């Protein structure tokens, strides 16, 4: 196993009102598993991803990733670990307004030793893999509303991550582009061992997955397994379970 969670707890407050968004979530994600989380529209999902990674803090609970535990971990080794792995795809389209598309894509690759020609060739391959080409010299103001999503998605596939955290990858894309992105994610999971965690609302996107987790009011409610089944039967099961909820 890679990610281990045990009685997690989160609370947003200002010392006067302490509202609860997560109450006892337990997950046991294993290596090379395409786990997906979905359900509701007001419960804690992006907060669950934030606390699951190191981008935020926790109130009560322990999380284990690759053996070691984040209890006494400082803000230096944590940042180094977040830099070396854990590619991210945010929801609010976290781009930089003072840079270009190419610079935004190539920035995380510029840490250790990479050379100009290799970086250029890699960006070329990734860019015409997704579809954001001829937009290598345009600021993220003159660009459309879905090409920003494609750029943010492509930023996290360039530095060879070990874990990928997704947050509604198919939010502003049609059927074809969403299918292409999901197929690329599945290929990356299959050919090379790299766990992918994706949160989405459309059942079609969750059909490509291997497991689906339903969350309701910060609790574990039902858990499918797919397994030796075809895509159509799994999709019908997802639709029926969503209709029940």
Partner 1 sequence: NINQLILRNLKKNLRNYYLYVFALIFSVALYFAFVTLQYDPAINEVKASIKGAAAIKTASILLVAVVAIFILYANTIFIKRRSKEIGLFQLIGMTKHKIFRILSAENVMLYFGSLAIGVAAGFSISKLVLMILFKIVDVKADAKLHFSEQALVQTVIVFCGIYLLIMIMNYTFIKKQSILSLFKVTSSTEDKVKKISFFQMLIGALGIVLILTGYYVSSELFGGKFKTINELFVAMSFILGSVIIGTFLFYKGSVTFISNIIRKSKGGYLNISEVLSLSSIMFRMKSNALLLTIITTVSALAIGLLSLAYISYYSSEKTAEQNVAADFSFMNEKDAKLFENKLRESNISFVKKATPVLQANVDIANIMDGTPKEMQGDPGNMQLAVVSDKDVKGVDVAAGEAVFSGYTDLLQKIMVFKDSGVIKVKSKHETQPLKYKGLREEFLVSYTFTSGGMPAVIVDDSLFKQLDKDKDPRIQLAQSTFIGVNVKHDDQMEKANELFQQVNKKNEHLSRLDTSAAQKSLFGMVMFIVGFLGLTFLITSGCILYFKQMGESEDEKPSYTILRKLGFTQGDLIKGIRIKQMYNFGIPLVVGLFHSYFAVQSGWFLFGSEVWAPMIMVMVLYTALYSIFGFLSVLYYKKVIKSSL
79 binds, among partner 1, a second copy, ligand ATP, none (CB under 5 to 8 A by kind): partner 1
* One character per residue 115-134, x = contact with partner 1 (rule: CB under 8 A): -x--xx--------------
140 touches ligand ATP by CB under 6 A: no
144 touches partner 1 by CB under 8 A: no
Q: How far apart are CA 175 and CA 207, in angstroms?
A: 13
Q: Are 90 and 152 in contact (CB under 8 A)?
A: yes
* One character per residue 67-86, x = contact with partner 1 (rule: CB under 8 A): --------xx--xxxxxx-x
**Structure-block tokens of residue 184:** 């690329």
42 touches ligand ATP by CB under 6 A: yes
Nearer to a second copy, 5 or 173 (CB): 173
Question: Please, which residues have CB within 8 angstroms of residue 217's CB and are 6 or more apart in sequence?
Answer: 23, 40, 43
202 binds, among partner 1, a second copy, ligand ATP, none (CB under 5 to 8 A by kind): a second copy
Greatest distance between any 2 Cα atoms in the chain: 56
100 touches ligand ATP by CB under 6 A: no
Asked whether residue 40 is marked as a ligand-binding residue, the answer is yes
Q: How far apart are CA 12 and CA 48, in angstroms?
A: 13
172 touches ligand ATP by CB under 6 A: yes
Asked whether residue 41 is marked as a ligand-binding residue, the answer is yes
Q: Are 187 and 157 in contact (CB under 8 A)?
A: no
The 3-state DSSP class for residue 9 equals strand
Q: Which residues are annotated as a binding site for ATP?
A: 39-46
């Amino acid at each position: 196993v890679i990610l281990e969670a045990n009685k997690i707890r989160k609370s947003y407050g200002n010392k006067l009102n302490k509202q609860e968004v997560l109450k006892g979530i337990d997950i046991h994600i294993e290596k090379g598993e395409f786990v997906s989380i979905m359900g509701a529209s007001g419960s804690g999902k992006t907060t669950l991803l934030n606390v699951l990674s190191s981008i935020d803090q926790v109130s009560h609970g322990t999380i284990h990733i690759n053996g070691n535990d984040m209890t006494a971990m400082k803000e230096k080794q944590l940042a180094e670990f977040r830099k070396q792995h854990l590619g991210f795809i945010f929801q609010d389209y976290n781009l930089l307004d003072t840079l270009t598309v190419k610079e935004n894509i190539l920035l995380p690759l510029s840490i250790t030793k990479l050379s100009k020609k290799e970086a250029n060739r890699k960006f070329e391959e990734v860019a015409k893999e997704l579809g954001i080409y001829e937009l290598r010299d345009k600021y993220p103001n003159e660009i459309s509303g879905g090409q920003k999503q494609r750029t943010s998605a492509g930023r996290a596939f360039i530095h060879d991550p070990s874990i990928i955290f997704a947050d509604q990858p198919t939010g502003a894309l049609d059927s074809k582009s969403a299918s292409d992105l999901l197929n690329k994610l599945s290929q990356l999971n299959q050919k090379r061992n790299a766990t992918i965690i994706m949160v989405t609302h459309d059942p079609v996107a969750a059909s490509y997955c291997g497991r689906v987790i339903f969350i309701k009011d910060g609790q574990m409610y039902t858990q499918l397994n797919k397994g030796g089944q075809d895509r159509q039967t799994f999709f019908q099961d997802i639709m029926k379970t969503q209709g029940v909820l």
